[PDB]
Each structure stands twice: as structure tokens, then as C-alpha cells.
Amino acid sequence: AIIKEHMRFKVRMEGSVNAHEFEIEGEGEGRPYEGTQTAKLKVTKGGPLPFAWDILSPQFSKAYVKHPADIPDYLKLSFPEGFKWERVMNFEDGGVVTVTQDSSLQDGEFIYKVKLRGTNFPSDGPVMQKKTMGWEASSERMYPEDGALKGEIKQRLKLKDGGHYTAEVKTTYKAKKPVQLPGAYKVGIKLDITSHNEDYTIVEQYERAEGRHS
């Protein structure tokens, strides 16, 4: 009842990647029970970014995951208070992205606050050279542990000139109040940049996500 079949969100990210500082603000919408959403993001400080948007895109929304009714939808249940998440992405060439996020339901919309630090991306690698071309579909393996929900992904980025570039990703998602944790399951996810201006200072993205038994 709290979360409707259509919901909007607002997001702000403060970040740095290889010490380049920036800020992004955006607005999103979607169908939380159907697992679909879009957002429009704007670089408000530090633009144009001297690195691939694709490392930022997975940081812009776990209320919008379709769940069968027999898999507790822990992150939906956490509202209106919401939940926090912390993520590390370890890329194959030594690049690292660490992310901290707070999610809540305020004034009838989800509110997302994100802090991101990317480090040790090779200056001539595909991230800093903007040679990426979007994420392949992911399977995030979920399981509860120590009163939180953990997810693991072998996440694969397509490169413009061919081939993939991979990160090992671990995330912990923790509700701000004790609500029912699920058992082990998997979430199939596909994220796409659907529109962008030439320098990626304005970007729209779409994501579909659906949980299923292992």
C-alpha cells in the first residue's frame, strides 16, 4: 500500500574518479512491482566528465525489482524509512569503485543520496579513455547474512572496439528497520543508457530487474 505501482525518485551523487570531483542530480520514475525504471541525470558540477558514464550508471534503485510473492521484498518492506547500501566494484585492471547510498521515501517520492569514489583506473584504460559501450545483462546473487542482504555480481562492460571489461562487485543492502529478509535468490538485471548528449552531461537510463529462485 505504501509503495504504489508507479513511483518517482530524486537522486544526487557526489563523487570523484581518479580525483576528478563532480556532482550529479537527477529524477527517475518506474513501476516498482514490475521491476522497470528510467532516470534522467545531469552533471551539475565537474562536467564534462573525463571518464565513462558506465561506471556511474549502476549507482542510480532496488525498490524497483520484481519479486515473486514468496521471496520477501526486504528492500520494499524497508520503506518509508528505507535502507542503505555499500558497494565495491573491483575491475580487472585494478580500478576500484566504492559507493555509499541512502534510500528513503520522502514527500511521496524515493530520495537517493550517493557518494562515490573511483580510484586507480589506468589513465590509458577504457574507463578514463571513454571506450565503454554499456553493461551486459547481470545476475546478482543475493543472500542474507548478519542481518543484511548481500549481493554478488560478475559484472561485464562491453567495450567500443570489441571485448569486455569486467568487475567483481559486492554490495550490502541494509534496511533501517528490521523487516523480513529473503533466502538465497538471484536477480536478473539489464541496464542501458537510452539517451545522452554528446559529452554525457545529460544522460537517460533504463533498468529492468527481476528476482527469481536460484
Side-chain angles (χ1 to χ4, degrees), residues 1-140 142-145 147-159 161-214:
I2 298 171
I3 297 173
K4 305 305 182 186
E5 289 191 271
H6 182 268
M7 295 291 288
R8 300 187 179 281
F9 71 83
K10 297 173 181 175
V11 57
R12 181 178 293 161
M13 171 186 287
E14 297 173 0
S16 69
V17 171
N18 278 19
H20 183 94
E21 300 181 31
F22 62 94
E23 286 198 19
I24 289 163
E25 296 181 350
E27 313 81 42
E29 57 81 43
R31 306 276 299 178
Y33 301 91
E34 295 160 24
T36 56
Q37 65 183 301
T38 61
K40 181 174 186 170
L41 298 317
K42 294 175 296 293
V43 180
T44 53
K45 303 179 188 173
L49 305 174
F51 59 83
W53 187 270
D54 287 329
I55 65 163
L56 307 182
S57 58
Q59 328 312 335
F60 301 113
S61 179
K62 293 291 194 170
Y64 302 80
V65 178
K66 177 173 178 174
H67 280 78
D70 65 324
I71 301 179
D73 201 334
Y74 173 72
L75 301 178
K76 283 192 185 61
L77 292 166
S78 76
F79 289 102
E81 295 91 337
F83 64 97
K84 296 178 179 188
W85 60 265
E86 292 182 352
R87 175 173 290 165
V88 182
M89 312 178 78
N90 288 312
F91 289 86
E92 63 182 60
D93 62 357
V96 177
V97 174
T98 302
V99 195
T100 308
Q101 201 266 17
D102 191 291
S103 298
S104 58
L105 177 55
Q106 298 183 52
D107 195 28
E109 303 188 14
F110 299 119
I111 299 298
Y112 300 158
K113 300 183 158 61
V114 195
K115 305 102 173 180
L116 180 144
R117 187 194 80 252
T119 53
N120 286 350
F121 285 100
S123 62
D124 57 353
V127 169
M128 301 311 295
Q129 293 298 313
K130 294 178 212 174
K131 297 185 295 186
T132 70
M133 187 166 275
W135 297 97
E136 300 284 5
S138 292
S139 179
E140 188 169 359
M142 311 302 304
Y143 65 104
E145 181 159 279
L149 182 58
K150 294 192 175 179
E152 298 182 5
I153 322 173
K154 182 173 69 180
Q155 212 174 321
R156 299 188 66 184
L157 200 45
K158 299 210 303 184
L159 298 193
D161 298 326
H164 291 91
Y165 174 64
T166 301
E168 300 191 339
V169 181
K170 294 182 170 55
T171 312
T172 301
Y173 310 87
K174 176 74 166 300
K176 295 164 183 174
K177 61 182 173 189
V179 285
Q180 186 183 17
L181 285 159
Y185 71 114
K186 60 186 180 184
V187 179
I189 304 166
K190 183 69 182 68
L191 171 62
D192 289 273
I193 294 176
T194 53
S195 186
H196 65 83
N197 64 2
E198 181 180 350
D199 67 2
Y200 290 79
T201 54
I202 307 180
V203 179
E204 297 188 352
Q205 41 180 92
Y206 179 95
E207 185 176 300
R208 184 179 185 100
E210 178 173 358
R212 294 179 181 181
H213 285 294
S214 308

